[PDB]
Amino acid sequence: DKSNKLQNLVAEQLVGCGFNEILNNSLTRAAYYDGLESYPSKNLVMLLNPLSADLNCMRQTLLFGGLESIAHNANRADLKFFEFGNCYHFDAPYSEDYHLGLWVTGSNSWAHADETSVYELKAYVENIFKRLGLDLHSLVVGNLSDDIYSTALTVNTKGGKRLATFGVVTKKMLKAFDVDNEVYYADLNWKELM
Amino acid sequence: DKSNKLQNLVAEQLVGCGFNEILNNSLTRAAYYDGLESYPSKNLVMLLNPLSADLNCMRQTLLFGGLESIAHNDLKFFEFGNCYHFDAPYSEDYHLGLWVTGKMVSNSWENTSVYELKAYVENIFKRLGLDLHSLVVGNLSDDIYSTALTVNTKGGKRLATFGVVTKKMLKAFDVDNEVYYADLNWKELM
Amino acid sequence: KSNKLQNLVAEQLVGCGFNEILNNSLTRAAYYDGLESYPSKNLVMLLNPLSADLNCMRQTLLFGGLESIAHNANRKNADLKFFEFGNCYHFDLAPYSEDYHLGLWVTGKMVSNSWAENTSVYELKAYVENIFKRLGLDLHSLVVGNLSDDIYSTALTVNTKGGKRLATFGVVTKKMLKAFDVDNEVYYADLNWKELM
Amino acid sequence: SNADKSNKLQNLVAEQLVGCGFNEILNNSLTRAAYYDGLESYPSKNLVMLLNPLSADLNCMRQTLLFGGLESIAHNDLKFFEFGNCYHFYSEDYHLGLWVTGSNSWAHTSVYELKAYVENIFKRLGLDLHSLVVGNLSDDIYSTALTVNTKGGKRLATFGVVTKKMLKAFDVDNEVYYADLNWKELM
Ligand SMILES: [Mg+2]
């Protein structure tokens, strides 16, 4: 109920900020994870006879679905998408966790150099954090450069639980998914924010 | 888009009728489907190395999760969730399930509870702006329901199924009260 | 104020599963042929009509909504619920006048000759009642009359004690659904918005 | 029998209320349709009307105990209660009504005392307080009120402050706090 009410509130808040809520399938492609360090293939919840099926595993991250939606969007530089959803993980060796993903897509002039950056995403994230009554001074923030992120921040409790990751998707990953304009991605560990 | 708002409107309406929302794992046990006809074992989306763990497949039906929840805890539960089907042989579909507990199972002296359950479903349909007159209602008793109604389009597409869960099924789940179960094919209703 | 209330009523209707529609004010004079409720002689005719289908300004919202229902046919199992705010025009120094209306259209069952309109007027009555409440209108001040004409098989009128029409709503005639290629029943309300202010 | 049980609990509650200073009142089941003219909460359309209603002062069955209690208040800090059948289109439902009438100096009236009496009735009846859903209400009867429902949504009680208008109609001054408990539903 706490989750459900707070999900509703976070959604209303994000829609009020011009976000669109998306829904992607939990069924996904194992190949997306081939070679990955942050979401390794060995931790995929694989399905039976996976050679004979295109969708052959359960998603370990929301990220790839979001990239598919962006790539497929008729209007694809002003996109703000969010998705609440279960992800799946193999080490009970199997686990199901609930995530909130955010996707924000993004001139010449001196006057208008102050506009599209990761910081607009960080603001969205902070505002979610404040709406959940998170103590901002408790947070331990670290740095990440990834197979998914060229740069990004990790956000942990003083106790060590991962609360969030957010940053700038590598251009390579964007090329892989047929997306041209910059993408800022946040993965919020929803259970840990209660 | 329209789905999200309606889910919310339906969740609120159900809470107002004293329902509590539940969330069950999409990972489940193939053994639940053993010898079922309505949700055949052969249509289960099994996991790779199914012997490696207790959880060994994706759910085909929301039903069993709800029975587990009833057997865990007069209950009224609802759940929005994906189910998974093996026929790209692997698909996912979105369902709304309702569980309503009734009287203790006894040998003492089902019609009237199906019609209480039907009232909740009607009110869901109205909230979805559905044309009640366009529906075709059928009778059903199977391995899931001793007594149930099916709701089809005039073309014969299934939109909902609801009724009384078999005593055998109740027994399989250590459930001691009668259970009234609805499964709404939510995507089909959009 | 009118603007504030229009927004409030729109939000309420959208909340109830309505979609707002917008239809052209330029329309077809032949729709009004032989009508008594909106007579052909009271139409505001164009000096330079574009065609037989575009030769006058609308006298009623009704017809545009029936066109919209016709164009919104679906294979889904859902009622269409539409509303529209718009001006209508009347010919009677200044013979041409305009007034502002809110129309509501709600579709029902497929037209059939099967056994079993009373319950339809009662369902539409609720949306109208809640609009009135939203406008702070005092229900017990209103006088409700019965009506049957070329538009409605069965209808209610809502009037002030003085006899001023505030709303009309009911079941659209079968003949009219047919003439518009609409194959579901239609419950239609016309609220005279300015009079509600 | 069920009626034997209702009778016993009715007596326990009546003794408890009397002990607390209430007087039991009894009013006619026959009433005036005029009372219900224009009401939303108890619609005129739902009265069990008697034949030739224009030719009888008392021309219908009561839907609510409220009006008889207001008549009783006029005719006498009062505390009144009444058990009695109500009628509407078909239902006969037994109800319990409670009426309580009501400084400004810092050292030293409201609905809170009425709530306490209601809560004490719920407890006498073994009703689990923690399963109850409370809502707000404002209408032609109450300027402010709480509604009390079961989890599933069945109305068990309504209690609050009667509108000054309603009280004006029955020649009643000051404040009246009124509770209507759906006795049948509490059995
Ligand atoms: Mg006392």
Question: Structural domain boundaries of chain A?
Answer: 1-193
Distance from CA of B133 to the nearest CA of C (A): 6
Distance from the alpha carbon of residue D161 to the mean position of ligand 1, in angstroms: 21
Of B26, B45, B22, B188, the C-alpha closest to B100 is B22
Q: How do strand D91-101 and strand D176-181 relate by DSSP bridges?
A: antiparallel
Distance from the alpha carbon of residue D79 to the mean position of ligand 1, in angstroms: 12
Per DSSP, the three-state class of D152 is coil
Chains A and C in direct contact, meaning 3 or more beta-carbon pairs closer than 8 angstroms: no
User: Rounded to whole angstroms, what are the CA distances from D109 to B14, B185, D46, D112, D144?
Assistant: 38, 55, 35, 8, 14
Using an 8 Å CB-CB cutoff, list chain B residues near C81.
Answer: 129
Q: Do B55 and A94 touch (CB under 8 A)?
A: yes
Number of H helices, E strands in chain D: 5, 9
Take residue C127 and report the two structure tokens written for it: 């949306």
User: Rounded to whole angstroms, what are the CA distances from D117 to C114, D18, D80?
Assistant: 56, 12, 12
Give the other-Cβ count within 10 Å of D24's Cβ.
Answer: 11
Per DSSP, the three-state class of C62 is helix
A27/A155 Cα distance (integer angstroms): 28
Spacing of C-alpha B154 from chain mean position: 22
Query: Which residue from B131, B135, B153 is facing C79, i.e. has the nearest CB?
Result: B131
Q: Do B88 and A45 touch (CB under 8 A)?
A: no
Among B131, B136, B154, B187, the residue to mutate for chain C (most C Cβ within 10 A): B131
Distance from CA of C89 to the nearest CA of B (A): 33
Q: Do B159 and C108 touch (CB under 8 A)?
A: no
D5/C24 Cα distance (integer angstroms): 69
Of A152, A158, A176, the C-alpha closest to A36 is A176
Q: Which residues lie closer than 8 Å to B88 by C-beta, 6 or more apart? A: A53, A54, A55
Rg (CA), chain A: 17
Chains C and B in direct contact, meaning 3 or more beta-carbon pairs closer than 8 angstroms: yes
CB A87 within 8 A of CB A96: yes
CB A14 within 8 A of CB A6: no
Of A186, A21, A188, A176, the C-alpha closest to A104 is A186
C188/C83 Cα distance (integer angstroms): 10
D112/B116 Cα distance (integer angstroms): 37
DSSP A32-68: GGTT-SSS-GGG-EEBSSGGG-SS-EE-S-SHHHHHH
Distance from the alpha carbon of residue C56 to the mean position of ligand 1, in angstroms: 77
Take residue B129 and report the two structure tokens written for it: 């702006």
Residue with tokens 């009704």: C62
Chain D contact partners (≥3 CB pairs within 8 A): B
D125/B125 Cα distance (integer angstroms): 38
In this structure, what DSSP letter does residue C51 have? B
Q: What is the dihedral of CA B4, B10, B12, B13, to 10 degrees?
A: 160
Give the other-Cβ count within 10 Å of D80's Cβ.
Answer: 23
Strands, E assignment, C39-182? 44-45, 56-57, 81-91, 96-110, 143-147, 152-159, 165-172
DSSP D5-60: HHHHHHHHHHHHHHHTT-EE----SEE-GGGGTT-SSS-GGG--BPSSGGG-SS-E
The chain B residues in contact with chain D (CB within 8 A) are: 16-18, 76
Q: How do strand C152-159 and strand B76-86 relate by DSSP bridges?
A: unpaired
CB C125 within 8 A of CB C142: no
Take residue A15 and report the two structure tokens written for it: 């829609």
A42/D13 Cα distance (integer angstroms): 69
SS (H, E, C) chain B: CHHHHHHHHHHHHHHHCCCEECCCCCEECHHHHCCCCCCCHHHCEEECCHHHCCCCEECCCCHHHHHHHHHHCCCEEEEEEEEEEECCCEEEEEEEEEEEEEEECCCCCCHHHHHHHHHHHHHHHHHCCECHHHCEEEEECCCCEEEEEEEECCCCCEEEEEEEECHHHHHHCCCCEEEEEEEEECHHHC
> H-helix or E-strand containing D66?
helix D66-75
Distance from the alpha carbon of residue D183 to the mean position of ligand 1, in angstroms: 21
Q: Which residues lie closer than 8 Å to B183 by C-beta, 6 or more apart? A: B61, B62, B63, B95, B96, B97, B160, B161, B162
> H-helix or E-strand containing A154?
strand A149-156
In this structure, what DSSP letter does residue C34 have? T
Of C131, C157, C122, the C-alpha closest to C142 is C157
D35/D43 Cα distance (integer angstroms): 10
CB A168 within 8 A of CB A79: no
Give the other-Cβ count within 10 Å of A81's Cβ.
Answer: 22
Whole-angstrom distance between the N-terminal and C-terminal Cα of chain A?
A: 11
Q: Sign of the C-alpha dihedral, residues B60, B63, B66, B68?
A: negative
> H-helix or E-strand containing A186?
strand A183-189
Q: Is C166 left (phi over 0), alpha (psi -120 to 50) or beta?
A: alpha
CB B42 within 8 A of CB B14: no
Q: Helix, strand, coil shares of chain D as percentages rounded to 5? A: 35, 30, 35
Using an 8 Å CB-CB cutoff, list chain A residues near B3.
Answer: 23
Give CA angle at B28 (B23, B31), nearest 5°: 140
Question: What's phi and psi for C158, nearest 5 deg?
Answer: -120, 125
Using an 8 Å CB-CB cutoff, list chain B residues near A86.
Answer: 26
A70/A89 Cα distance (integer angstroms): 25
C76/D57 Cα distance (integer angstroms): 55
Q: Which residue of C has its CA nearest to B135?
A: C77
User: Rounded to whole angstroms, what are the CA distances from D156 to A71, A159, D43, D64, D179?
Assistant: 56, 48, 19, 14, 11
D177/A24 Cα distance (integer angstroms): 55
Give the other-Cβ count within 10 Å of B182's Cβ.
Answer: 24
Residue B39 carries which side chain, given as an amino acid letter?
A: Y
Of C119, C23, C122, C110, the C-alpha closest to C71 is C23
The chain C residues in contact with chain B (CB within 8 A) are: 17, 76-79, 81, 107-110, 184
User: Rounded to whole angstroms, what are the CA distances from B190 to A83, B11, B138?
Assistant: 19, 16, 21
C112/C116 Cα distance (integer angstroms): 10
In this structure, what DSSP letter does residue D150 have? -
Query: Which residue from A46, A53, A96 is facing B25, i.e. has the nearest CB?
Result: A96
Take residue B140 and report the two structure tokens written for it: 């059903």
Give the other-Cβ count within 10 Å of C155's Cβ.
Answer: 23
B32/C21 Cα distance (integer angstroms): 50
What is C1-196's CATH superfamily?
Bira Bifunctional Protein; Domain 2 (3.30.930.10)
CB A68 within 8 A of CB A177: yes
Among C77, C107, C127, C186, the residue to mutate for chain B (most B Cβ within 10 A): C77
Rg (CA), chain C: 17
Query: Which residue from B11, B26, B88 is facing A96, i.e. has the nearest CB?
Result: B26
In this structure, what DSSP letter does residue A83 have? E
A131/A123 Cα distance (integer angstroms): 12
CB A169 within 8 A of CB A150: yes
Among B7, B133, B137, B157, the residue to mutate for chain C (most C Cβ within 10 A): B133
Give CA angle at B104 (B98, B105), nearest 5°: 95
Spacing of C-alpha A60 from chain mean position: 11
Take residue A163 and report the two structure tokens written for it: 């609360």
Query: Which residue from B20, B55, B88 is facing A55, i.e. has the nearest CB?
Result: B88
Residue with tokens 């021309």: D59
Q: Which residues lie closer than 8 Å to B43 by C-beta, 6 or more apart? A: B60, B85, B86, B87
Take residue A96 and report the two structure tokens written for it: 């199901």
**Determination technique for this entry:** X-ray
Chain A contact partners (≥3 CB pairs within 8 A): B
Buried b (16+ CB within 10 A) or exposed e, B53-64: eebbbbbbbbbb
Residue with tokens 């545009």: C64
Using an 8 Å CB-CB cutoff, list chain B residues near C107.
Answer: 131
A100/A14 Cα distance (integer angstroms): 12
Residue with tokens 């505390």: D79
Among A3, A48, A56, the residue to mutate for chain B (most B Cβ within 10 A): A48
Q: Which residues lie closer than 8 Å to C6 by C-beta, 6 or more apart? A: C85, C193
C183/B134 Cα distance (integer angstroms): 13
Of B100, B74, B82, the C-alpha closest to B181 is B100
C148/C172 Cα distance (integer angstroms): 10
What is B1-189's CATH superfamily?
Bira Bifunctional Protein; Domain 2 (3.30.930.10)
CB A172 within 8 A of CB A163: no
Query: Which residue from A46, A53, A92 is facing B47, i.e. has the nearest CB?
Result: A46
Give the other-Cβ count within 10 Å of A41's Cβ.
Answer: 15
B135/B139 Cα distance (integer angstroms): 13
Take residue D153 and report the two structure tokens written for it: 């949504």
Question: What's phi and psi for C194, nearest 5 deg?
Answer: -55, -40
Distance from the alpha carbon of residue C160 to the mean position of ligand 1, in angstroms: 52
D72/A4 Cα distance (integer angstroms): 50
Q: Which residue of B has its CA nearest to D131?
A: B18
D99/C59 Cα distance (integer angstroms): 57
A193 burial via Cβ count (<10 Å: 0-12, 13-18, 19+): buried
C27/C53 Cα distance (integer angstroms): 6
Using an 8 Å CB-CB cutoff, list chain D residues near B17.
Answer: 152-153
Please list the residues that pair with B78 across neighbouring strands.
B21, B98
CB A159 within 8 A of CB A68: no
Distance from the alpha carbon of residue D17 to the mean position of ligand 1, in angstroms: 7
CB B148 within 8 A of CB B114: yes
In this structure, what DSSP letter does residue A74 have? T
B154/C79 Cα distance (integer angstroms): 15
What is A1-193's CATH superfamily?
Bira Bifunctional Protein; Domain 2 (3.30.930.10)
Query: Which residue from C17, C77, C108 is facing B153, i.e. has the nearest CB?
Result: C77
Q: Which residue of D has its CA nearest to B77?
A: D152
Distance from CA of D128 to the nearest CA of B (A): 13
A186/A166 Cα distance (integer angstroms): 4
Q: If you classify domain D1-186 with CATH, what class do you get?
A: alpha beta
Long-range contacts of B153-156 (CB under 8 A, 24+ apart): B153/C77
Q: Do A27 and B52 touch (CB under 8 A)?
A: no
Residue A121 carries which side chain, given as an amino acid letter?
A: L
A148/A150 Cα distance (integer angstroms): 7
Per DSSP, the three-state class of C118 is helix
Distance from CA of B151 to the nearest CA of A (A): 26
Q: Do A8 and B3 touch (CB under 8 A)?
A: no
